[PDB]
Design a protein around this ligand. Structure first.
Ligand SMILES: */O=C(\[N])[N][C][C][C][C]([N])C([O])=O
Length: 271
């Protein structure tokens, strides 16, 4: 039953995020207080509103990017792959996630291979298979350690934004939310070519807005957190057509300046 979760692991953002977090382009100053309000609302949604049991990890001032828990672990059924992030300075974020995932009683596999890198952001799990983006953060070797870790599922690579999921994510069972850029469309074509199964697409005009969180929640049904009309009015109009989904608009305008999107800030676990 695709999209079932019971627990979410999140991590508070440090003050140092505003000045020190990595970012692909020069942009507006981060309002850290607003980032913090935004992250608290996102956590309220997962935990309070949807009834996930949320594990809130503490902020660490020396890891400015520690809010982006998605990059440090990939979880599938009862197994957590603790990644080796492509940004060397992010590698230490791994320790606290490992301990949290142990306490959730997952089987833990650690990427230790000094020649392997992988960000969880480069990883798209469709319910049937994995697509893994080969980017500046995720290499071949990292993708192979992922394949060797989740033996029950097919894994395929796609050349890559920062990550594969900078422009796609699952919006439902068999439904790939996808951006409209040359990049997003070239990647999707490769993904579609490499798999026998036929996925449906939800094409949005804003690549960044194709990053959403889908959940299947008992007594709720299909649930989708997506970017707001205020941030991306033309993409929100697309999500609005999902009449069988509970649609929840979530802002991430602040974290967006350091390249974070909706999926970057939780690890969703079914237990
Ligand atoms: O979107 C995901 N999964 N991660 C965003 C990480 C952004 C961060 N500033 C970095 O690693 O550069």
């Amino acid at each position: 039953a695709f999209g079932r979760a019971t627990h979410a692991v999140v991590r508070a953002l440090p003050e140092s995020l505003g000045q020190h977090a990595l970012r692909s382009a020069k942009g507006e100053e981060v309002d850290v207080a607003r980032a913090e309000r935004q992250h608290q609302l996102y956590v309220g949604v997962l935990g309070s509103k949807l009834g996930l049991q949320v594990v809130e990890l503490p902020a660490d001032e020396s890891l400015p990017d520690c809010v982006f828990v998605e990059d440090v672990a990939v979880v599938c059924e009862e197994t957590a792959l603790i990644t080796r992030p492509g940004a060397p300075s992010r590698r230490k974020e791994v320790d606290m996630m490992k301990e949290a995932l142990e306490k959730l009683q997952l089987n833990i596999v650690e990427m230790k291979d000094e020649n392997a890198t992988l960000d969880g952001g480069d990883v798209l799990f469709t319910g049937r298979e994995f697509f893994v983006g080969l980017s500046k953060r995720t290499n071949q070797r990292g993708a192979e350690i992922l394949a060797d870790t989740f033996k029950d599922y097919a894994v395929s690579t796609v050349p890559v934004g920062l990550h594969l999921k900078s422009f796609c994510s699952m919006a439902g069972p068999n439904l790939i939310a996808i951006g409209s850029s040359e990049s997003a469309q070239k990647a999707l074509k490769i993904m579609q070519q490499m798999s026998d199964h036929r996925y449906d697409k939800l094409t949005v005009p804003d690549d960044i807005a194709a990053n959403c969180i889908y959940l299947n929640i008992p007594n709720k049904g299909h649930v989708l957190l997506h970017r707001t009309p205020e941030e991306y009015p033309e993409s929100a109009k697309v999500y609005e057509k999902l009449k069988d989904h509970m649609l929840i608009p979530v802002s991430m305008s602040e974290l967006e300046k350091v390249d974070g999107l909706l999926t970057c800030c939780s690890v969703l676990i079914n237990k």
